[PDB]
Amino acid sequence: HHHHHHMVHITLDRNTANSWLIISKDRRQVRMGDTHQNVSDNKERFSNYPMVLGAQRFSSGKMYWEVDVTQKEAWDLGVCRDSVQRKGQFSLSPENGFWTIWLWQDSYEAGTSPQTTLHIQVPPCQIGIFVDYEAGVVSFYNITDHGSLIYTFSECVFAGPLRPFFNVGFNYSGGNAAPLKLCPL
């Protein structure tokens, strides 16, 4: 992939975060806190899961960014509609407005309905996310393995503005405290 030259500077939107998340001062890192983080509730916040959106909204063009997932046991990454459900239980699927991959219990899977098994030989420490709005494409790249393709969602029906999507995952095990970090360009 030669997608690096569509690189965009992504920052996290505090106001969308689950109330247990801690976003860094530079808005480039997020991690699970050990308690509720002393913020008011609002209609933007993901209530049931440790999720947060990027501040940027995309309705055209080609966009690329990279996320560091080093030492995490569980996470979800990708893009979603600006109008996704925030409150209650829901599944990550294109029908619900999400184009995502994840790590869960040592398996990587794409957020199709039902979910698709991914085949990754080299556990990634960084993930590249490529969106082509006009083509209807969301692609995922293994930066640790020379940029090798992980998954492509094609014929996507975005049906509105897109936002970068993140889930740091729960930390019941004590092995998933590490942050998601947006990597420098």
Ligand X SMILES: Cc1nsc(N2CCCNCC2)n1
Does 18 help bind ligand X (rule: CB under 6 A)?
yes
Q: Which is nearer to ligand X, 27 or 86 (CB)?
A: 86
CA-based Rg of the chain, rounded to a whole angstrom? 15
Two structure tokens written together for 134: 């006009």
CB of 172 to ligand X, least distance (A): 6
CB of 59 to ligand X, least distance (A): 30
CB of 41 to ligand X, least distance (A): 12
Phi, psi at 28, each rounded to 5°: -115, -5
Residue among 8, 20, 37, 125 that touches ligand X (CB under 6 A) = 20
Residue type, 72: K
Question: Which of these, 78, 79, 77, lies nearest to 57 by C-alpha position?
Answer: 79
Q: Judge contact between 82 and 15, C-beta under 8 A.
A: no
Question: Which of these, 139, 145, 110, lies nearest to 126 by C-alpha position?
Answer: 145
User: How many chain residues bind ligand X (CB under 6 A)?
Assistant: 5
Binding positions for ligand X, 133-152, rule CB under 6 A: none
Cα–Cα distance measured from residue 175 to residue 153, given in angstroms and rounded to the nearest whole number: 30
CB of 50 to ligand X, least distance (A): 5
Does 173 help bind ligand X (rule: CB under 6 A)?
no
Helical H runs in the chain? none
Q: Is 114 left (phi over 0), alpha (psi -120 to 50) or beta?
A: beta
Residues in the chain: 185
Residue among 39, 61, 107, 170 that touches ligand X (CB under 6 A) = 170
Show the site string, 44-63: x = touches ligand X by CB under 6 A, - = not: ----x-x-------------
Q: Which is nearer to ligand X, 92 or 156 (CB)?
A: 92
CB of 171 to ligand X, least distance (A): 6
Q: Which residues of this chain interact with ligand X, rule CB under 6 A?
A: 18, 20, 48, 50, 170
